[PDB]
Amino acid sequence: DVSFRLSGADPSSYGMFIKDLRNALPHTEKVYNIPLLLPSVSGAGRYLLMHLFNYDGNTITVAVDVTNVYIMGYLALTTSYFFNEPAADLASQYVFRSARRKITLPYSGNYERLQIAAGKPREKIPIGLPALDTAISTLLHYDSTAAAGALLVLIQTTAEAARFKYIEQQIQERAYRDEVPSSATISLENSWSGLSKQIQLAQGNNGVFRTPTVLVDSKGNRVQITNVTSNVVTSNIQLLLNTKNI
Numbered sequence: 001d002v003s004f005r006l007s008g009a010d011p012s013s014y015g016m017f018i019k020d021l022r023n024a025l026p027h028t029e030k031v032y033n034i035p036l037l038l039p040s041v042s043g044a045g046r047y048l049l050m051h052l053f054n055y056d057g058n059t060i061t062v063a064v065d066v067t068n069v070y071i072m073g074y075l076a077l078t079t080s081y082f083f084n085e086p087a088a089d090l091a092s093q094y095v096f097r098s099a100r101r102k103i104t105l106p107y108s109g110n111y112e113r114l115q116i117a118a119g120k121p122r123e124k125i126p127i128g129l130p131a132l133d134t135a136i137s138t139l140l141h142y143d144s145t146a147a148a149g150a151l152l153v154l155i156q157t158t159a160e161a162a163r164f165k166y167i168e169q170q171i172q173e174r175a176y177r178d179e180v181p182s183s184a185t186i187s188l189e190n191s192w193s194g195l196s197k198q199i200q201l202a203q204g205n206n207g208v209f210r211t212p213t214v215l216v217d218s219k220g221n222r223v224q225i226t227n228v229t230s231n232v233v234t235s236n237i238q239l240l241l242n243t244k245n246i
Protein backbone atom coordinates (compact mmCIF):
# COMPACT_ATOMS: atom_id res chain seq x y z
CA ASP A 1 0.00 0.00 0.00
CA VAL A 2 0.92 3.68 -0.31
CA SER A 3 -0.37 6.79 1.64
CA PHE A 4 -0.70 10.61 1.42
CA ARG A 5 -1.76 13.23 4.08
CA LEU A 6 -3.04 16.64 3.08
CA SER A 7 -2.56 17.96 6.64
CA GLY A 8 0.91 19.60 6.56
CA ALA A 9 1.55 18.63 2.99
CA ASP A 10 4.06 20.68 1.03
CA PRO A 11 5.68 20.17 -2.43
CA SER A 12 8.34 17.86 -0.96
CA SER A 13 5.89 15.40 0.81
CA TYR A 14 3.59 15.17 -2.20
CA GLY A 15 6.69 14.34 -4.40
CA MET A 16 7.49 11.56 -1.93
CA PHE A 17 3.92 10.06 -2.26
CA ILE A 18 4.26 10.08 -6.02
CA LYS A 19 7.63 8.29 -5.86
CA ASP A 20 6.09 5.59 -3.64
CA LEU A 21 3.07 5.11 -5.96
CA ARG A 22 5.50 4.51 -8.91
CA ASN A 23 7.70 2.08 -6.99
CA ALA A 24 4.56 0.03 -6.03
CA LEU A 25 3.87 -0.95 -9.60
CA PRO A 26 5.68 -4.15 -10.59
CA HIS A 27 7.87 -4.71 -13.63
CA THR A 28 10.27 -7.39 -14.96
CA GLU A 29 12.00 -5.10 -17.49
CA LYS A 30 12.73 -1.48 -18.47
CA VAL A 31 12.53 -0.19 -21.97
CA TYR A 32 14.77 2.79 -22.53
CA ASN A 33 15.35 3.09 -18.84
CA ILE A 34 11.55 3.20 -18.01
CA PRO A 35 9.56 0.55 -16.23
CA LEU A 36 7.38 -1.65 -18.38
CA LEU A 37 4.04 -2.45 -16.60
CA LEU A 38 3.02 -6.20 -16.59
CA PRO A 39 0.79 -7.86 -19.26
CA SER A 40 -1.24 -9.43 -16.48
CA VAL A 41 -1.40 -10.26 -12.80
CA SER A 42 -3.73 -12.89 -11.26
CA GLY A 43 -5.81 -12.67 -8.17
CA ALA A 44 -5.86 -9.92 -5.63
CA GLY A 45 -2.24 -9.15 -6.53
CA ARG A 46 -3.61 -7.13 -9.38
CA TYR A 47 -4.78 -4.31 -7.12
CA LEU A 48 -2.78 -1.64 -5.19
CA LEU A 49 -4.34 0.25 -2.28
CA MET A 50 -3.96 4.01 -1.73
CA HIS A 51 -4.84 5.60 1.58
CA LEU A 52 -5.72 9.31 1.28
CA PHE A 53 -6.53 11.86 4.07
CA ASN A 54 -8.14 15.32 4.00
CA TYR A 55 -7.00 18.35 6.09
CA ASP A 56 -9.41 17.17 8.83
CA GLY A 57 -7.94 13.65 8.81
CA ASN A 58 -10.92 11.69 7.36
CA THR A 59 -9.96 9.03 4.82
CA ILE A 60 -10.78 6.84 1.82
CA THR A 61 -8.94 3.84 0.36
CA VAL A 62 -8.62 3.78 -3.36
CA ALA A 63 -8.07 0.40 -5.25
CA VAL A 64 -5.76 0.72 -8.29
CA ASP A 65 -5.09 -1.85 -11.10
CA VAL A 66 -1.29 -2.34 -11.26
CA THR A 67 -1.21 -3.26 -14.95
CA ASN A 68 -2.59 0.07 -15.97
CA VAL A 69 -2.89 2.52 -13.01
CA TYR A 70 -6.71 2.71 -13.33
CA ILE A 71 -8.79 3.42 -10.25
CA MET A 72 -11.40 0.59 -9.79
CA GLY A 73 -13.31 1.91 -6.72
CA TYR A 74 -12.84 3.14 -3.19
CA LEU A 75 -13.97 2.51 0.31
CA ALA A 76 -15.49 5.32 2.44
CA LEU A 77 -16.26 4.13 5.99
CA THR A 78 -18.46 1.06 5.40
CA THR A 79 -19.65 1.51 1.88
CA SER A 80 -17.65 0.42 -1.19
CA TYR A 81 -18.28 2.21 -4.45
CA PHE A 82 -17.07 0.69 -7.78
CA PHE A 83 -17.24 2.02 -11.25
CA ASN A 84 -19.92 0.38 -13.33
CA GLU A 85 -17.43 -1.69 -15.57
CA PRO A 86 -16.31 -5.36 -15.77
CA ALA A 87 -12.71 -4.75 -14.51
CA ALA A 88 -14.22 -3.04 -11.43
CA ASP A 89 -16.81 -5.72 -10.92
CA LEU A 90 -13.98 -8.29 -11.08
CA ALA A 91 -12.02 -6.16 -8.62
CA SER A 92 -15.07 -6.16 -6.27
CA GLN A 93 -14.43 -9.88 -6.05
CA TYR A 94 -11.04 -9.27 -4.45
CA VAL A 95 -11.04 -5.82 -2.63
CA PHE A 96 -13.24 -4.14 0.09
CA ARG A 97 -14.75 -7.50 0.90
CA SER A 98 -15.59 -6.17 4.40
CA ALA A 99 -17.98 -3.32 3.27
CA ARG A 100 -21.64 -3.38 4.44
CA ARG A 101 -23.03 -2.53 1.09
CA LYS A 102 -21.53 -2.17 -2.32
CA ILE A 103 -22.82 0.70 -4.48
CA THR A 104 -22.16 0.53 -8.13
CA LEU A 105 -21.63 4.13 -9.22
CA PRO A 106 -24.00 5.19 -12.00
CA TYR A 107 -21.00 5.64 -14.45
CA SER A 108 -17.79 3.83 -15.57
CA GLY A 109 -14.37 5.37 -14.81
CA ASN A 110 -13.24 6.93 -17.99
CA TYR A 111 -12.77 10.67 -18.26
CA GLU A 112 -15.54 11.15 -20.84
CA ARG A 113 -18.32 9.45 -18.73
CA LEU A 114 -17.09 11.19 -15.58
CA GLN A 115 -17.17 14.68 -17.12
CA ILE A 116 -20.85 14.03 -18.13
CA ALA A 117 -21.88 12.99 -14.62
CA ALA A 118 -20.02 15.99 -13.07
CA GLY A 119 -21.59 18.60 -15.37
CA LYS A 120 -18.29 20.08 -16.56
CA PRO A 121 -15.05 19.01 -18.24
CA ARG A 122 -11.79 18.82 -16.41
CA GLU A 123 -10.25 21.96 -18.06
CA LYS A 124 -12.73 23.89 -15.86
CA ILE A 125 -12.14 21.99 -12.67
CA PRO A 126 -9.37 23.38 -10.50
CA ILE A 127 -6.83 20.88 -9.21
CA GLY A 128 -4.10 21.00 -6.68
CA LEU A 129 -3.68 19.97 -3.14
CA PRO A 130 -6.61 22.00 -1.75
CA ALA A 131 -8.82 20.44 -4.41
CA LEU A 132 -7.69 16.96 -3.36
CA ASP A 133 -8.81 17.73 0.26
CA THR A 134 -12.28 18.77 -1.12
CA ALA A 135 -12.42 15.58 -3.24
CA ILE A 136 -11.76 13.31 -0.30
CA SER A 137 -14.48 15.23 1.73
CA THR A 138 -17.09 14.78 -1.06
CA LEU A 139 -16.44 11.05 -1.65
CA LEU A 140 -17.05 10.40 2.05
CA HIS A 141 -20.85 10.65 1.56
CA TYR A 142 -22.58 9.54 -1.53
CA ASP A 143 -23.74 12.20 -3.88
CA SER A 144 -23.22 10.68 -7.33
CA THR A 145 -23.02 14.06 -9.06
CA ALA A 146 -20.61 15.56 -6.56
CA ALA A 147 -18.56 12.32 -6.64
CA ALA A 148 -17.92 12.53 -10.37
CA GLY A 149 -16.08 15.88 -10.02
CA ALA A 150 -14.19 14.67 -7.01
CA LEU A 151 -13.09 11.51 -8.93
CA LEU A 152 -11.74 13.70 -11.71
CA VAL A 153 -9.60 15.54 -9.18
CA LEU A 154 -8.42 12.29 -7.57
CA ILE A 155 -7.39 10.56 -10.74
CA GLN A 156 -5.24 13.45 -11.95
CA THR A 157 -3.58 14.20 -8.71
CA THR A 158 -2.59 10.49 -8.24
CA ALA A 159 -2.40 8.22 -11.29
CA GLU A 160 -1.53 11.01 -13.72
CA ALA A 161 1.26 12.45 -11.56
CA ALA A 162 2.72 8.96 -11.19
CA ARG A 163 2.77 8.60 -14.98
CA PHE A 164 4.47 11.97 -15.72
CA LYS A 165 7.11 14.00 -13.85
CA TYR A 166 5.73 17.17 -15.33
CA ILE A 167 2.26 16.53 -13.93
CA GLU A 168 3.77 15.89 -10.55
CA GLN A 169 5.58 19.26 -10.74
CA GLN A 170 2.31 20.99 -11.69
CA ILE A 171 0.51 19.69 -8.62
CA GLN A 172 3.57 20.87 -6.59
CA GLU A 173 3.09 24.41 -7.70
CA ARG A 174 -0.62 24.16 -6.67
CA ALA A 175 0.21 23.16 -3.22
CA TYR A 176 -1.60 26.10 -1.64
CA ARG A 177 -3.79 27.48 -4.42
CA ASP A 178 -5.92 25.54 -6.89
CA GLU A 179 -5.68 26.25 -10.57
CA VAL A 180 -7.25 24.48 -13.49
CA PRO A 181 -4.82 22.10 -15.23
CA SER A 182 -2.16 23.44 -17.66
CA SER A 183 -2.81 22.60 -21.30
CA ALA A 184 0.33 20.26 -21.27
CA THR A 185 -1.25 18.35 -18.40
CA ILE A 186 -4.43 17.44 -20.20
CA SER A 187 -2.31 16.52 -23.22
CA LEU A 188 -0.04 14.07 -21.43
CA GLU A 189 -3.00 12.37 -19.73
CA ASN A 190 -4.62 11.87 -23.05
CA SER A 191 -1.33 10.56 -24.62
CA TRP A 192 -0.18 8.01 -22.09
CA SER A 193 -1.43 4.88 -23.86
CA GLY A 194 0.03 6.17 -27.17
CA LEU A 195 3.46 7.05 -25.75
CA SER A 196 3.71 3.69 -23.98
CA LYS A 197 3.09 1.86 -27.22
CA GLN A 198 5.55 3.96 -29.26
CA ILE A 199 8.38 3.50 -26.77
CA GLN A 200 7.94 -0.27 -26.80
CA LEU A 201 7.93 -0.31 -30.62
CA ALA A 202 11.11 1.76 -30.70
CA GLN A 203 13.08 -1.21 -29.50
CA GLY A 204 13.71 -2.91 -32.90
CA ASN A 205 13.40 0.35 -34.69
CA ASN A 206 16.57 2.06 -33.59
CA GLY A 207 14.81 4.19 -30.97
CA VAL A 208 12.46 5.70 -33.52
CA PHE A 209 8.68 5.89 -33.03
CA ARG A 210 6.65 4.02 -35.67
CA THR A 211 4.01 6.77 -35.26
CA PRO A 212 4.85 10.25 -33.77
CA THR A 213 2.84 11.63 -30.89
CA VAL A 214 1.55 15.17 -30.74
CA LEU A 215 1.75 17.07 -27.40
CA VAL A 216 1.58 20.51 -25.70
CA ASP A 217 4.73 21.82 -23.93
CA SER A 218 5.59 23.70 -20.73
CA LYS A 219 5.20 27.02 -22.44
CA GLY A 220 1.81 26.14 -23.94
CA ASN A 221 3.12 25.35 -27.35
CA ARG A 222 3.01 22.29 -29.53
CA VAL A 223 5.71 19.76 -29.85
CA GLN A 224 5.82 16.51 -31.85
CA ILE A 225 7.62 13.48 -30.41
CA THR A 226 9.60 11.20 -32.80
CA ASN A 227 12.23 9.27 -30.92
CA VAL A 228 13.57 8.27 -27.59
CA THR A 229 16.00 11.17 -27.27
CA SER A 230 13.12 13.54 -26.61
CA ASN A 231 12.93 14.94 -23.06
CA VAL A 232 9.35 13.54 -22.84
CA VAL A 233 11.09 10.10 -22.94
CA THR A 234 14.38 10.94 -21.23
CA SER A 235 12.98 13.26 -18.55
CA ASN A 236 9.16 12.99 -18.15
CA ILE A 237 7.26 9.69 -18.64
CA GLN A 238 7.83 7.33 -15.72
CA LEU A 239 5.71 4.24 -16.49
CA LEU A 240 4.74 2.32 -19.65
CA LEU A 241 1.35 0.55 -20.31
CA ASN A 242 2.21 -2.93 -21.73
CA THR A 243 1.20 -3.27 -25.45
CA LYS A 244 -0.54 -6.55 -24.50
CA ASN A 245 -3.18 -4.18 -22.88
CA ILE A 246 -3.60 -1.80 -25.81
Ligand SMILES: *[C@@H]1O[C@H](CO)[C@@H](O)[C@H](O)[C@H]1NC(C)=O
Pocket residue numbers: 208226227228229230231
Ligand atom coordinates in the same frame (compact mmCIF):
# COMPACT_ATOMS: atom_id res chain seq x y z
C1 LIG B 1 14.85 12.90 -32.50
O1 LIG B 1 14.70 13.74 -31.37
C2 LIG B 1 15.07 15.13 -31.44
C3 LIG B 1 13.95 15.84 -30.70
O2 LIG B 1 14.17 15.61 -29.34
C4 LIG B 1 15.19 15.84 -32.80
O3 LIG B 1 15.93 17.06 -32.72
C5 LIG B 1 15.79 14.93 -33.85
O4 LIG B 1 15.84 15.66 -35.09
C6 LIG B 1 14.98 13.61 -33.88
N1 LIG B 1 15.63 12.74 -34.87
C7 LIG B 1 15.12 11.65 -35.48
C8 LIG B 1 16.05 10.97 -36.45
O5 LIG B 1 13.99 11.15 -35.32
